Structure formats: C-alpha cells, structure tokens
Design a binder for this molecule. Structure first.
Ligand SMILES: Nc1ncnc2c1ncn2[C@@H]1O[C@H](CSCC[C@H](N)C(=O)O)[C@@H](O)[C@H]1O
Ligand SMILES: Nc1ncnc2c1ncn2[C@@H]1O[C@H](CSCC[C@H](N)C(=O)O)[C@@H](O)[C@H]1O
Ligand SMILES: O=Cc1ccc(O)c(O)c1
Ligand SMILES: [Mg+2]
Ligand SMILES: [Mg+2]
Lengths: 242, 239
C-alpha cells in the first residue's frame, strides 16, 4: 500500500540488543556457538548477514537452543512459520531424526531459495515440505484435514509478528498435548518493557504493542504452560496442556 | 579468620539491557505462573544473607519447562541452598518422580523445607548433606544402567563444575541433560581481566572461562549456552 518506506534501513531498532553487553554477546557466539555451528549453517548465516532483511535472521545462539529443545523432547514432526533464508529451518532439520518431517511455510520462496543450496549440502532437504503461502490459510486448511495421530511435536513461529495471537489459536490445536510452540521475538528489542517508546517505525511500534498484548495473553492462557527466555530477541516456549 | 555477601562485587543478577526489561519478564511472564509455595520460598530467601545465590525466577520457570518437555522422571540437583530450583523441579516432575538433592548445608534446605512440604512434593526428594564430589563418586561405584538420571542441575561451588561434569556425563543417561547455572558469571566471563572482584569471584570467573571452553570442545555432549538469569549451559549426553 502507499505510505512510508518499510525497508530494514527505515527501522529504528535494528542495532539495539537485549543484553546490556555487546562483549558478552560476542563471547557467547565465539565460545559456545560458532565452534558448534554446522558448516552449512555458517555459510547460510554469512550470506544472510549481507541480505537486505538480515535483521530478521534468527540469532545463532538461539539456533543452538532450538536444536537442543528439539533433541531433548525427541521431536519428529514439526512446523515452522516464517522461513526466510532457512537458518532455523536448517537448524531444525539437522536436529530431527533421519525420517523427521517439517512443514515450512513462508510467503516468499525466493528467500528460501537463498538457503536451499546450504540445506541441500547438509543432506536434510528431504525432511522439508515447503509451502509458499500466507501461513493463516495453510493453518486453517490443516485444522480441517489434520488427524490426531499426526499432530506436530513442535512449532516455531517467526513470521509476521502482529499475527502471532492469530497463529496461536490454530497452533494450540495443531500441536500435540505436551508439544511445544515457540514464539520468536517476544521481547522485541526490549521495547515491550515500556508502555510507550518514542522513535519507532510504525511497523516496529505495531509489533511492540502486539507483543505486549501477546505476552499478557500467553501468561493468562490455561491451555499452555509458558517460559519466556531472554535469548536472541526473546522467545516464549509454550507447552500444550490440553 | 574469626569475625562476622556485601564483601562481593557481584550482587545483582541482570545480564539484560535494563532493570526494566528483567522486571517486565518477571511480572509479565514469571510471577503469574509461579506456584504459591515458590513465591513464599523466594520471598523468605530474598531476605537471607546469601540471597544473591538464589536461582533467577525466570530461569526456574525455564528449568520447569525443560523437565516437562523431556519427560524427565529421575533427576539430580547439586547445590540446593533454600530449595527454589529443587521445589521447581519437584513440582515439574510426575507424581512418581525422584530427585537426589545434594548440598553441604542442610540448614539452608530447612528454610525451604516447609514450602516443599506444603507443596506436597517432599516425597520426591532424597536430600543428602555432603560435599557433592564424594556422593557422585560413590554413586558411580554402585549405580546400574536402570538408575541413570534424566537430568542434572549443577548450581553449587563453581570451581568444581568441571569435576562435576566428569561424573555427571556417566550418571546421566544418553540423551539426558546436564544443566550448569551461572556460566556467564554476571557478564565477567566476557573479559580476560576484570577489575575489583573478590578473590572468590575472580576464581569463579577464571573457572567458568575454562569450563565454557571445555564444554564447547567436549565430544561427549552437545551444548547450548543460554543468556537467561546468570547464564546456563544445557548439555545433552551423546554417548
Ligand atoms: N503472513 C505470512 N505468512 C507466512 N510467512 C510470512 C508472512 N508474513 C511474513 N512472512 C515471512 O516470515 C519470515 C520472517 S523472518 C523468519 C526468520 C527465520 N525463521 C530464520 O531462522 O532466520 C519472512 O521470510 C517473511 O517472508
Ligand atoms: N561442595 C559442595 N557440595 C554440595 N553443595 C555445595 C558445595 N559447595 C557449595 N555448595 C552449596 O551450593 C549451593 C549454591 S546456591 C544453590 C542455589 C539453588 N539451586 C537455588 O535454586 O536457589 C549452596 O547451598 C552451597 O551450600
Ligand atoms: O556464590 C555465590 C552465587 C551467586 C550466584 C549464584 O547463582 C550462585 O549459584 C552462587
Ligand atoms: Mg525472529
Ligand atoms: Mg546459581
């Protein structure tokens, strides 16, 4: 639509961190992440860091953390909403068993095509079913065809942040009891801690407001237990109770 | 010598950008989800002379999530203090869950014991008053494959963590988790030198810098260091 430019260079928050120490974040990455990062993850991250939407790239320490959750819960079937160039998707596919399966949904397959050669070299493209679409129609179509036996173990939600509350209403039915839904970016550069925050792009401000509403909603939702984790840009792990 | 936590440079646990962000996480996402007996235990512990030791409450809720997601049933805790992470664990486990809890100081555990009892989960806990290293070595001579733990939380004397790790990678099952608290040690690990630390705090800075490298290099586990609370490192045993 007509209006203000909404490129990454038009945003205010790009360089802001949720850790107070830039040195600490680099310590974590150099000590505990890069030595443990798959060579194809490294290549995909390095190409994505140059891309015009590099701000959206999941953080590499968050990557290893998502991998750990998947392995510890023995996830086998997962859904990812918001693929971009494929870092969390490649992380997920490397974590799952050889016969694991991922439903991966993104409006923009051209982004996916950037990471695809890395995912192919890693030997795990066969686990991925990529759907080029807005996520909400796909999720609604799943609700009508999904069997109890095929509920997902794990969902990673990282797409268009104002829609998370809408995705949640479907995902609490598409993930198994005991399964996990992980919402990325729920601390939104730390701006969620303030009732108003000057200087934001209108899309940044909409996400600040969206996440303040989502974080209250998830804390109050009896269908899940939650843990909000100050890693990357914040994430909230939800475990379906019924 | 003879005489009488204020001697220490590291008293506030917040690696986040602002005190406001951490408070927001706690009020929005932790306190509404915190069991009444955890709230009571935390509030009495905040008045204890070693309250800085108390596990961060957002970290507690995350431990609880991890335990449930991995369906843990048998756990070991090294370093109990007043029992916040222990009560968190006992509330997270199924009714038949079992915890081996080890601390040198039972008087601290007795501060938390009434809340654990009121919470109805004392039956899950075998508390052992001892330095942990002898206990783990004794367990290694005796335990069989059926007695392996699903999960270990390590939150005791920081310079001994690498020593604990060598026992725990044998006492935790393949695929189980070993979780180390405080591996970012108030942010000090990010620096090769750090001014003004108490001799014990500096010793922990050095030991954590050594431990973090060791765990990153250890082929027996995979890891994830997580910038929550004072940092924790989750290890999953590979073989
Ligand atoms: N309505 C919608 N439905 C599905 N995908 C959407 C969407 N709106 C935006 N997206 C996609 O969501 C993605 C968010 S960035 C995703 C980052 C990725 N998980 C990583 O690990 O780096 C973008 O690729 C964008 O194209
Ligand atoms: N060698 C050792 N063996 C077992 N416990 C030890 C120890 N050295 C120190 N400790 C104990 O380790 C604890 C660290 S504080 C533990 C915090 C607790 N897990 C919480 O949730 O708040 C103290 O209670 C201390 O008494
Ligand atoms: O010894 C002091 C201490 C300080 C912080 C901690 O988290 C801890 O476990 C111990
Ligand atoms: Mg994200
Ligand atoms: Mg601790």
């Amino acid at each position: 639509g007509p209006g203000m430019g909404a490129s990454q260079d038009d945003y205010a928050l790009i360089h802001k961190n949720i850790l107070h120490s830039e040195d600490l974040l680099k310590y974590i990455l150099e000590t505990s992440v890069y030595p443990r990062e798959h060579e194809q993850l490294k290549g995909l991250r390095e190409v994505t860091e140059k891309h015009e939407w590099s701000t959206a790239l999941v953080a590499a320490d968050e990557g290893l953390f998502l991998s750990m959750l998947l392995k510890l819960m023995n996830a086998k079937r997962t859904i990812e909403i918001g693929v971009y160039t494929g870092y969390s998707l490649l992380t997920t596919a490397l974590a799952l068993p050889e016969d694991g399966k991922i439903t991966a949904i993104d409006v923009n397959k051209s982004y996916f095509e950037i990471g695809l050669p890395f995912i192919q070299k890693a030997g795990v493209e066969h686990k991925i079913n990529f759907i080029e679409s807005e996520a909400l129609p796909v999720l609604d179509h799943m609700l009508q065809e999904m069997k109890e036996e095929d509920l997902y173990d794990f969902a990673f939600v990282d797409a268009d942040k104002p829609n998370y509350a809408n995705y949640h209403e479907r995902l609490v039915k598409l993930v198994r009891v005991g399964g996990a839904i992980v919402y990325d970016n729920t601390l939104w550069f730390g701006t969620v801690a303030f009732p108003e925050y000057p200087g934001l792009h209108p899309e940044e401000e909409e996400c600040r407001v969206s996440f303040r509403n989502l974080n209250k909603l998830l804390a109050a939702d009896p269908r899940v237990e939650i843990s909000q984790v100050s890693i990357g840009d914040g994430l909230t792990i939800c475990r379906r109770l019924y």
